[PDB]
Symmetry: C3
Subunit: 462 residues, 3 copies
């Protein structure tokens, strides 16, 4: 853990380096089966309460099975706008659709006749891993049928009721979780796949030992980037499909960019111009190029490790890293946006905070022991979380992050002081440096042409 | 199931036809009641464990009732921006507010004195359907009071504890689900309304048989577009309001539009212009006009049937369908947006995928048996899911949808090759064809006027 | 409850006054502890079913503890774009990180040796409130060990199994809720903090009596603006951190602004200009200034009281209230946006509805007794919820809110009739009154200069 952070005063932005990558670059699909029963009907002219409880539990089981069948017979009769779209569950749904052909269920049942785990080939020629996580058929047919199938339902025992309830609870919960999500669920609960079974699926994937260890250590995130799909219920067997991620890129450098608006500080109201850098997010080296994640909601962090998803990313060249040290470079075209609004805000970075204090707003950073230790002036400034606990930007109070690290301050004149406020192209959402430069150079051309003609007409007088 | 898809090369967009509509055009409200008890106090100088368990369950019941009373005494002392706003629970909240007038609870209790279902008229003159889904009062008053009301609490039986737990669990879950949602819940769980009661409410609505059948078959979606509202707890009765949808438009044609950016392929960096069609979403014929759903999150699909919601829609004329066959028609004004960014992406359609490959990005589509089967050039292209499993657009891998259907390819020169790159109005977010045409015709007017004057001054020399 | 609403016809917007404020201006953190056990191993050569049930429950407990340890050893090896960013759980995470130093667990255990509540000082010098909400150690070590530690596991009793299940359920649920949320949860469930313990924490905060009463009455919202953070599991004790809000500003006036587009009604298609007010949200007086909440998802309402959050707000001067009575005031610069789209929509306010009816759309408001009672013309209009139940704007049907109040109608000519349609700066997303005025005054300057030169050249002929 050697996270470092730099502040660039010339553009009012910060970069945090020192992380490691774990990117998702594929999917893995398996099949999970449950062996049910087909209890026909229960009939007793009894009066004991234990028989009543047994009948109630059996009724709940039948209702769950019927609801599952009914559900099955319904499916088969700033730069966030630059991203393409895709379907997240295409592979699992394809496997589920393959499962509906005739003879597949017989193949699955024949494969797992003796053992609880096997590898079977489907019709099209794909091999998937199967499992049998529960078996209610044997217990029901060997315990409950002798009590209630033909006899007068004489005497169940008190322990049998509790045992049956404990057995049936998991199936009830699985039915409940499929029911409300219309078939496809979000992070796979403990009922769908036990923590002792997730660690067993991982030790069967065709991956390297390092990826196996990474998936085993951080198992609470593999569970948050997975899907579960209901497939079929027929011929006394239940089957659903689990879709697990694959991490093909591991241990490559990553960094994050924090940006804030940078304005001018003229006293006259409504006489200030601003610009802001719009490309803020996560960047990670990936096979000779940089991947950009702008949604700020697809990447998780565990203290040095970032678990991103490559379906909501952009592939940029390796020169995108050069916008930091220099902004007027003739090799990349950094992205900005312009406006004319002067409002104070603050951005809480990983190792400090950025404060923009424009207008008459009072901005202050305070320590918890002495009290007030800094009074910001008008501009973009940055303070580190070493002796600072909270920062206030007016009516708002923020708490800074207290991670240990090293922060550096880079001086330099702001770039907003180089432009001409009489020709600046305001209200230019999602512009770039070259576009802004082009829009300015041509207005002066019109002005000069006008001046030329005006001089010329006063030259031809005589 | 006869879904069809077309690709229009001239605008880099695709249309998928063949669906059917089921639109929500109203609400239906009912009342669900529960009959509670008013156990005052329990006192025993006992030592048996069964008495302890009974007391614990009674304490949980009292705590749930108290929490419900406390909650009740708190409420009564791209084109996604074009949509208006509305309140989703106005009708249910209105009914709940009507329920608070004096004498309403007496009317409800008198209506359901003997049967479990009745129709009653409130004060203002509206008739609603009531129900009684649970009755703990009779069981408690006829079983638990003889054990603990006055006596020394001699001997409960072991089965009674389990029976009471099973009875009380549902009320505990209902209290839990109201507690965390502040009164109004999202898709109605199995505890609020049993699957055997939802199918009974549907057979009492004033609707046609076809709508009844549609609601009965797809019951997992009627449950996802419904609300539950806590109303009152007083005079030993609990009542909450359920708000069910109504589907007034059924079996009308629908289709979806997929759009992707279309750019120019000049070699020089920063010398390309782009435009994109911004109106992508679901369209459905509705009584002589087309309804547009741009949020891309309000419509569900079950293999040919689309369950949309009409509160987040727009009403467009019937000529909006004409932007597909022609884009320069003098009857509608299709909506576009312009920029100057050249980044590669991909859009996964229903029966294929659209690939945009600009710059130095390597784009490829691969089959799972042979391997690589296509290498895209620079431009907008489209490939169908017949012999293609995955497509990669650089560092990203996508899985195409494997639905069966028929796809067609329509040729034609791209429209971006007709414009003049010296006067093209870039950075024009949310423009239209006529606006872009107007902004170009007037710059040439200024240029021609300038040329006219410049020639004229050199005509008056002598 | 004296809510009032006004409609300003000149700008097609409405204001609803009469509310009260309860703003969050800080955090409060406490520690919740659970006393576990360290059962080593269970071994019985038994055959009774009760022993089997006991062993199963013990196995579940061990699995929960192991999963918790594994999770712990993973974290330590329109104007919505104007808002700054911040970290919501900085304080709780800081306290959790402080908890990991050596000797802290010993201090916590020594503080709560005898009582269930104490105040203890950590290493850095901060005092926090601790608690002991559950004790499984004593029950396990005094009941289950005599049954299964060394003996042949002779006879458990039937009531012991149920008692142990009831004890263990809460720990199982806590483990389940941490497991799927990766450590940090959203609104604190009933398992993490009992409703009888939340009301006990509130009576220990260093706050005034009025804030205590406000927090006690509306306890279902204090629970929705809180976080729970997993911290540690070691040395036979479990500890997690709860982060509760603080309400520093209470009983200050608030109001809401509703805005809708305002267009021109020329008959020719594609010849209309529009403008819309973009600053819609909640405003609340706060210490000599107004706080603006634009996200429309951070503020809740209970019939006169608004529970907002100050982390997603903006601090504006006190002159922002002046845009309502007048829009051309020389003291503030109200924010608008321009376009050229004519589409009909509707905005449902608190005491009525705003209807915009442009083009050939049919807009109508209907009562539930007579039927149709109003037919809107082309323009922006407003109708109150007194004799009106629903309003339709085409293919869409809306339900108005039926709250009691007083509404007022303010006449005045629309401002869109003052501009010149030949120089109006369309497609100017997020503009302002002064910017639009500036962009118009300078085009006329160019036209006049052109005319001047053209006259001048025809003056020098001879
Ligand atoms: C991290 O920095 C520390 C300095 O305290 C030192 O151990 C070394 O430079 C780095 N350790 C690594 C990269 O393992
Ligand atoms: C000046 O005009 C040239 C075209 O001749 C253009 O390429 C350039 O971007 C403009 N601005 C500057 C600063 O050179
Ligand atoms: C759907 O297409 C098939 C062609 O395979 C044929 O049955 C018919 O054209 C269509 N059936 C319908 C619309 O029911
Ligand atoms: C040309 O100018 C006319 C106005 O005289 C305008 O209506 C039209 O949109 C412009 N462009 C074209 C292609 O006609
Ligand atoms: C609210 O209005 C009512 C009028 O019916 C009246 O009691 C008084 O003006 C107000 N009451 C308050 C503010 O307590
Ligand atoms: C007119 O031009 C002046 C600059 O001389 C500018 O300040 C003003 O905003 C423009 N418009 C009006 C209506 O005065």
């Amino acid at each position: 853990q050697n996270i470092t952070e730099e502040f660039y005063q010339s553009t009012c932005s910060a970069v945090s380096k020192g992380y490691l990558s774990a990117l998702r670059t594929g999917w893995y699909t398996s099949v999970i089966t449950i062996e049910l029963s087909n209890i026909k009907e229960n009939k007793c002219n009894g009066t004991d309460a234990k028989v009543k409880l047994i009948k109630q539990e059996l009724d709940k089981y039948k209702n769950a099975v019927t609801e599952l069948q009914l559900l099955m017979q319904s499916t088969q009769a700033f730069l966030g706008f630059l991203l393409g779209v895709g379907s997240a569950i295409a592979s699992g749904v394809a496997v589920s659709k393959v499962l509906h052909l005739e003879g597949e269920v017989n193949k699955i049942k024949s494969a797992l006749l003796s053992t609880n785990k096997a590898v079977v080939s489907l019709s099209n020629g794909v091999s998937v891993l199967t499992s049998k996580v529960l078996d209610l058929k044997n217990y029901i047919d060997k315990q409950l049928l002798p009590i209630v199938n033909k006899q007068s339902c004489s005497i169940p025992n008190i322990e049998t009721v509790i045992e049956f309830q404990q057995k049936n609870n998991r199936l009830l919960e699985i039915t409940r979780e499929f029911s409300v999500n219309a078939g496809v669920t979000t992070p796979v609960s403990t009922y769908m796949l036990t923590n002792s079974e997730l660690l067993s699926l991982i030790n069967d994937m065709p991956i390297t030992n390092d990826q196996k260890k990474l998936m085993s250590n951080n198992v609470q995130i593999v569970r948050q980037q997975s899907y579960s799909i209901m497939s079929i219920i027929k011929e006394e067997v239940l089957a659903y499909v689990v879709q697990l991620p694959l991490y093909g890129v591991i241990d490559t450098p990553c960094w994050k960019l924090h940006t804030s608006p940078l304005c001018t500080t003229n006293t006259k109201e409504g006489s200030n111009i601003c610009l802001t850098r719009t490309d803020r997010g996560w960047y990670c080296d990936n096979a000779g190029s940089v991947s950009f994640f702008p949604l700020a909601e697809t990447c998780k962090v565990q203290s040095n490790r970032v678990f991103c998803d490559t379906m909501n990313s952009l592939t940029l060249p390796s020169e995108v890293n050069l916008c930091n040290v220099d902004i007027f470079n003739p090799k990349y075209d950094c992205k900005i946006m312009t406006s004319k609004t002067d409002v104070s805000s603050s951005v809480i970075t990983s190792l400090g905070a950025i404060v923009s204090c424009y207008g008459k707003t009072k901005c202050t950073a305070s320590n918890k022991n002495r009290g007030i230790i800094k009074t910001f002036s008008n501009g973009c400034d940055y303070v580190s979380n070493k002796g600072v606990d909270t920062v206030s930007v007016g009516n708002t109070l923020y708490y800074v992050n207290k991670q240990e690290g090293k922060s550096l301050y880079v001086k330099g004149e702001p770039i907003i002081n180089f432009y001409d406020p009489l020709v600046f192209p305001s209200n230019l959402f999602y512009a770039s440096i070259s576009q802004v430069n082009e829009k300015i150079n041509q207005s002066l051309a019109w002005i000069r042409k006008f001046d030329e003609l005006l001089h010329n007409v006063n030259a031809v007088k005589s």
